[PDB]
Amino acid sequence: TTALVCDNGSGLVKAGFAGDDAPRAVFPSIVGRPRHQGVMVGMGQKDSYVGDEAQSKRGILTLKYPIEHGIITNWDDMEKIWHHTFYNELRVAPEEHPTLLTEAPLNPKANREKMTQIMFETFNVPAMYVAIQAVLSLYASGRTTGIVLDSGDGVTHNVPIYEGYALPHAIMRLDLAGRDLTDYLMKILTERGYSFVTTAEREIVRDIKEKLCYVALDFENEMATAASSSSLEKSYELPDGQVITIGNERFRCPETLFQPSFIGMESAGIHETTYNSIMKCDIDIRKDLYANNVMSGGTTMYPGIADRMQKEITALAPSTMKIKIIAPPERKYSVWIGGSILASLSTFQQMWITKQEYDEAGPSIVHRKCF
């Protein structure tokens, strides 16, 4: 039968059926709970909203993401997320549909262990599997080599791969992503008079970040331009009107990606860790990687980030190589398409984890060679 693919992720869960060309269901991976008393009794005020319902009801809710940085901290909210997914978005019973789940590399083992435990016991899936998001993003691009830089909402990582073989000893993971960038935007939108403190308006700052922010090709010259001229200011109307104006922030914010020291982290930027992960690899297979830099995730949607990344990585790397960057136009959902392709394959039929073998060997089956 048809296999299911579920990309839990942070910020946005995206689920659908294998073999398709786009994910059928996408909605925010948030959970809401009311925070006022309620006086008009009988209106069916459910004690928990999920996904887009909470997104629409925010004004009376307190939003709580259940996956912080690739790791799950609340398993009740995550169970509710999965149940709402299956029974409202896909409207399919998991009784006969094997699912494909994803996680960031170097994650705690308990996360995937309990994920499989729950998927087998509570939802009773006939089979399942757990892949690494970067390999899925690569399979989506129809290659077999190339360093990949998946950067979503919680985590950022590099997985250098060659001919289908991934080098785990050079995986570099950075815990700076779109969420820390939204936090920095909320930090620096206060030097213009505006304030955002509620978790219902962190979503608003997130929308502003998506709409108006871009990347500076030369951060110093662009900062000087913002200082002298004023062409960069762009307006934005909050959901009650009172249009705001932001200037320097539009590129001051995602510059944190290239200099994490802005928000108090000691680590290096995106391009530096990329070049490092390359230099950790064998001296024979670095040119293929320089040629096949693959970008994915939602945070790599920034206008012009490709040119900036290329300039920085050419500044760092030698000058006699050819530095390419694969930034497809639909890169955001590349992980889901890669998962769908990996599922719809014919060689994959012995990679699943059947419920028989799960009951026979427990939740430690994923760390076993049946990955």
Contact residues toward ligand ADP (CB under 6 A) are: 9-12, 152-153, 178, 206, 209-210, 213, 297-299, 301-302, 332, 335
**What whole-number distance in Å separates Cα of residue 122 and Cα of residue 124?**
6
Residue (of 303, 265, 72, 250) closest to 177 by Cα position: 265
Q: How far apart, in Å, are the Cα atoms of 39 and each of 43, 56, 63, 295?
A: 10, 20, 21, 50
Closest CB to ligand ADP among residues 127, 141: 141
User: Which of ligand ADP, a copy of itself, none lies near 297, with the C-beta cut-off 5 to 8 A by kind?
Assistant: ligand ADP
Give the footprint of a copy of itself on residues 242-281 (CB under 8 A).
Answer: 242-243, 261, 263-264, 266-267, 280-281
The answer to whether residue 33 forms part of the interface with a copy of itself (CB under 8 A) is: no
Identified binder of a copy of itself from the candidate list 35, 96, 230, 328, rule CB under 8 A = 35
**Residue 164: which H helix or E strand, with range?**
none
Return the one option of ligand ADP, a copy of itself, none that residue 180 interacts with (CB less than 5 to 8 A, by type). Answer: none
CA 16 from centroid of its chain's CA atoms: 17
DSSP run (H or E) holding 13: strand 12-17
Taking contact as CB under 8 A, which single stretch among the options 10-18, 307-315, 329-337, 346-354 is the one that binds a copy of itself?
Answer: 346-354
Closer to ligand ADP by CB, 11 or 363: give it: 11
Spatial distance between the Cα atoms of 172 and 270, rounded to a whole number of angstroms: 10
Q: How far is the CB of 302 from ligand ADP (least distance, A)?
A: 5
| Closest distance to a copy of itself from the beta carbon of 60 (Å) | 5
345 is an interface residue for a copy of itself by CB under 8 A? yes
Q: How far is the CB of 123 from a copy of itself (least distance, A)?
A: 25
Q: Rounded to whole angstroms, what are the CA distances from 261 to 155, 256, 334?
A: 17, 7, 30
**By CB under 8 A, which span of 17-25, 58-66, 81-89, 218-226 interacts with a copy of itself?**
58-66
Round to whole Å and give the CA distance between 116 and 132: 15
Structure tokens that stand for 294 in this block:
């693959």
CA dist., res. 35 & res. 41, Å (int): 16
Residue 338 per-residue DSSP state: H
| Least CB distance to ligand ADP at residue 14 (A) | 6
- Closest CB to ligand ADP among residues 273, 299: 299
Least distance between ligand ADP and beta carbon 11 (Å)? 4
